Write an enzyme that holds these catalytic residues in place. Structure first.
Site, PDB file in Angstrom:
ATOM      1  N   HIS A 125       0.853  -1.220   0.000  1.00  0.00           N
ATOM      2  CA  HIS A 125       0.000   0.000   0.000  1.00  0.00           C
ATOM      3  C   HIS A 125       0.866   1.239   0.000  1.00  0.00           C
ATOM      4  CE1 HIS A 125      -3.052  -2.995   1.355  1.00  0.00           C
ATOM      5  NE2 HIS A 125      -3.812  -2.296   0.538  1.00  0.00           N
ATOM      6  N   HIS A 155       1.660   1.590  -5.732  1.00  0.00           N
ATOM      7  CA  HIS A 155       0.232   1.169  -5.822  1.00  0.00           C
ATOM      8  C   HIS A 155      -0.677   2.377  -6.198  1.00  0.00           C
ATOM      9  CE1 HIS A 155      -3.647  -0.610  -4.810  1.00  0.00           C
ATOM     10  NE2 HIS A 155      -3.832   0.260  -3.832  1.00  0.00           N
ATOM     11  N   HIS A 212      -5.881   7.551  -2.599  1.00  0.00           N
ATOM     12  CA  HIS A 212      -6.792   6.701  -1.884  1.00  0.00           C
ATOM     13  C   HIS A 212      -6.234   5.796  -0.791  1.00  0.00           C
ATOM     14  CE1 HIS A 212      -5.274   3.326  -4.207  1.00  0.00           C
ATOM     15  NE2 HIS A 212      -5.947   2.584  -3.339  1.00  0.00           N
ATOM     16  N   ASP A 213      -4.893   5.618  -0.719  1.00  0.00           N
ATOM     17  CA  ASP A 213      -4.329   4.788   0.337  1.00  0.00           C
ATOM     18  C   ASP A 213      -3.316   5.629   1.136  1.00  0.00           C
ATOM     19  OD1 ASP A 213      -5.479   2.235   0.685  1.00  0.00           O
ATOM     20  OD2 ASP A 213      -4.472   1.427  -1.204  1.00  0.00           O
ATOM     21  N   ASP A 252      -8.590  -0.222  -7.938  1.00  0.00           N
ATOM     22  CA  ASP A 252      -7.824  -0.631  -6.734  1.00  0.00           C
ATOM     23  C   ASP A 252      -7.316  -2.068  -6.914  1.00  0.00           C
ATOM     24  OD1 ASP A 252      -8.587  -0.792  -3.121  1.00  0.00           O
ATOM     25  OD2 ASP A 252      -6.719  -0.178  -4.136  1.00  0.00           O
ATOM     26  N   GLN A 292      -6.260 -17.287  -3.443  1.00  0.00           N
ATOM     27  CA  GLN A 292      -6.349 -16.392  -4.610  1.00  0.00           C
ATOM     28  C   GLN A 292      -7.532 -16.824  -5.466  1.00  0.00           C
ATOM     29  OE1 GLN A 292      -4.241 -13.431  -5.665  1.00  0.00           O
ATOM     30  NE2 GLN A 292      -4.511 -13.687  -3.458  1.00  0.00           N
TER      31      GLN A 292
END
Ligand code: MEW
Ligand code: NI
Ligand code: NI
Length: 330
Positions: free
Chosen positions: A80, A84, A118-119, A229, A281
């Site tokens: 993050h 990213h 956003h992060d 995202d 996953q």
């Protein structure tokens, strides 16, 4: 403590940065991987803002200050992080370019900025962790804890001297864009994705979806935020696989902390349970990624290449599970 601010050297450097000509063409495509171009990442963001929003959308000096301070308020965590942020911003650029006139000039500028921000100040810990161990942030922000924090950090950066890229907007447009940004960041809370996608799917299948309806627009923008995202799952397999190593590095670090607090972590966060990762996953692609890109493609047909790539990556995880993996580098 406090909000970090870029140096004069940093933003003046970005102001004079020029993007290699060959990359212009590449940056337009969904599958573009910023990985090999680290020095260029801030410049790539300027370029995308200028292409989507115009070279006169923001005062250049304020934009460069803003970008380089945003970079400085990302932490040196495995996933993050700054890389990213730019990856998510690039996916949004590609979605907007392919759907340009569905969105207002205000939405496009707000969304590209929302994605870069956003992060912000992510610490490498999940909402689950913050709430389990009553971090001060979970007291302040009872739901969507980190996302309310990232929005608060965005506003803090805008408030730094010379950083307010939105000041030239009318008082009414200024309020509207901060709301676009707040809603977009909050929407990156995956807890909210499940409800949002289900609602959109229903609105789509019954034909009630209407983009002139603000609440519908908000939900569509929400699903775009999820799609951006998660966009590591839409790159070429080797890129997707390398990024997953970074995601899991964060998860395993959080599980290590929970073990110190007397709680066994979920298997996903347990570094002693790496054998379960490929099935994990598979679960994530089936429950989150594939439905997201499926519905997004229904609403926005030009986003189909995201869905096709996601499906290709699901197939690769399936190959892993069957023992068919070939040589991989990390
Ligand atoms: C479990 C999980 N896997 C991911 C793979 C790619 C991108 C994001 C994620 C994620 O958020 N969670
Ligand atoms: Ni987040
Ligand atoms: Ni994110």
């Amino acid at each position: 403590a406090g909000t970090s601010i870029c140096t004069s050297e940093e933003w003046q450097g970005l102001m004079q940065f020029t993007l290699p000509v060959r990359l212009c063409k590449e940056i337009e495509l969904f599958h573009f991987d910023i990985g090999p171009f680290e020095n260029m990442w801030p410049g790539i963001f300027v370029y995308m803002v200028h292409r989507s929003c115009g070279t006169s959308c923001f005062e250049l000096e304020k934009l460069c200050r803003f970008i380089m301070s945003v970079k400085k308020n990302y932490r040196r965590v495995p996933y993050h992080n700054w890389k990213h942020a730019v990856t998510v911003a690039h996916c949004m650029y590609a979605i907007l370019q392919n759907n340009h006139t569905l969105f207002t000039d205000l939405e496009r500028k707000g969304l590209l900025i929302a994605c870069l921000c956003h992060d912000l100040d992510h610490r490498g810990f999940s909402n689950s962790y913050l709430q389990k161990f009553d971090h001060p942030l979970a007291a302040l922000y009872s739901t969507s804890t980190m996302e309310q924090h990232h929005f608060s950090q965005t506003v803090s950066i805008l408030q730094l001297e010379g950083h307010n890229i939105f000041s030239t907007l009318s008082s009414s447009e200024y309020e509207q864009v901060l709301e676009i940004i707040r809603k977009a960041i909050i929407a990156t809370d995956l807890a909210l994705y499940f409800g949002n996608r289900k609602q959109l799917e229903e609105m789509y299948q019954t034909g009630s979806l209407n983009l002139n309806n603000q609440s519908h627009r908000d939900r569509v923008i929400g699903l775009m935020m999820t799609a951006c995202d998660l966009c590591s799952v839409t790159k070429l397999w080797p890129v997707t696989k390398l990024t997953a190593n970074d995601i899991y590095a964060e998860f395993w670090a959080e599980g290590d902390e929970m073990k110190k607090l007397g709680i066994q972590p979920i298997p996903m966060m347990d570094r002693d349970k790496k054998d379960e990762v490929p099935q994990g996953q598979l679960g994530f692609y089936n429950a989150v990624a594939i439905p997201c890109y499926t519905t997004l493609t229904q609403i926005l047909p030009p986003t189909e290449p995201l869905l096709k790539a996601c499906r290709d990556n699901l197939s690769q995880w399936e190959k892993v599970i069957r023992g068919e993996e070939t040589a991989t580098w990390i």
